Amino acid sequence: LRRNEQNGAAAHVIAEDVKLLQFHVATMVDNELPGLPRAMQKSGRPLK
Amino acid sequence: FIGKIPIMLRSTYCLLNGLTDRDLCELNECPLDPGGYFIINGSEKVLIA
Amino acid sequence: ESRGFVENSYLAGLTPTEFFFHAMGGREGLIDTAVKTAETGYIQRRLI
Amino acid sequence: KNVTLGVPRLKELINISKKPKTPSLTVFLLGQSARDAERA
Amino acid sequence: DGLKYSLATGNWGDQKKAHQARAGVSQVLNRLTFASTLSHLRRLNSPIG
DNA sequence: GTACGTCCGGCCGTAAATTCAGATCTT
RNA sequence: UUUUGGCAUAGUUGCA
DNA sequence: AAGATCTGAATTTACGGGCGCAACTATGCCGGACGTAC
């Protein structure tokens, strides 16, 4: 998202980046909630 | 060829099928061993019903 | 005897039906011991 | 009669619940109906 | 590998969907005494469900 | 030319939400 | 000349 | 008087918890891409 703003990229990709960053920080503090699916570590195991 | 199937010991396809107790001793296999289990990486695995 | 009144003492030995009904009786003892242990501490920890 | 006791009842007493398993009223009488079976 | 892993770990179902897989079906055979081996081979497991 | 092979990219208690009867306003 | 260590799982078993 | 509103009071999903410790085991996260040798 930083290089998107530095380049001045399009808005829809920026919104998608904000969405994914929201999901990543939310599952980084709390990888269990009734929202998006859980985060896995690319090894078929949820993150702690 | 499509893969390899583990073979339950003393089944109809295990090499110990229908062997007398002498031949089991020659292969260092206990004749009183009931079988009924697989060998996976050397570990004896049994499937609980 | 039909509904599980065993009449022989342990000295005399139970009959097959009597033995099976006695095993049924002791199974509840084992299960209630298990659930007591399952509830061990929980009430006590909440209280303290 | 049959009334809940043991660790379930103790649980409900400490785990205060709006739903008792065996709620009851040990209700007493004072007049002649206390001794008269017909009136009670 | 697919059978092997499922028999090596006892997780049954799809490997990548092991989160919701039934576990403990396959167990290492208990070789402590012959009676224990026979008891383990003749064993039924009732899941909670 | 061909393959290999190894280095890089992908239960119960709250608690919120939905529907029904006074009440002031509106008419 | 002074070290040492895989985390998270799943199963089995002992005592209460 | 009638109404519409409309604002406080009865019914449905939905997290979120679920015994002290011990002991032992056994198992675990790739495919394109680029070069080099033969």
Side-chain angles (χ1 to χ4, degrees), chain A residues 22-46:
Chain A
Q22 173 70 80
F23 166 73
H24 281 175
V25 66
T27 193
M28 191 273 329
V29 298
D30 170 30
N31 194 15
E32 166 49 65
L33 56 87
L36 294 160
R38 306 287 161 273
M40 293 51 93
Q41 58 166 4
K42 303 178 74 60
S43 314
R45 188 172 63 77

Side-chain angles (χ1 to χ4, degrees), chain B residues 4-47:
Chain B
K4 306 177 194 175
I5 306 296
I7 301 301
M8 168 151 323
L9 265 73
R10 296 173 180 263
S11 177
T12 54
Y13 295 88
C14 168
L15 296 175
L16 311 182
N17 188 35
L19 293 187
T20 186
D21 303 335
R22 311 186 46 289
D23 300 337
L24 293 167
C25 294
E26 304 325 311
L27 305 180
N28 299 14
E29 289 291 332
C30 162
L32 303 169
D33 180 68
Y37 56 93
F38 308 91
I39 298 168
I40 306 303
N41 303 336
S43 181
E44 308 191 325
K45 299 284 179 167
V46 58
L47 305 185

Side-chain angles (χ1 to χ4, degrees), chain C residues 14-27:
Chain C
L14 314 180
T15 70
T17 66
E18 293 169 9
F19 171 81
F20 189 82
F21 299 140
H22 182 42
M24 221 160 320
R27 180 57 62 82

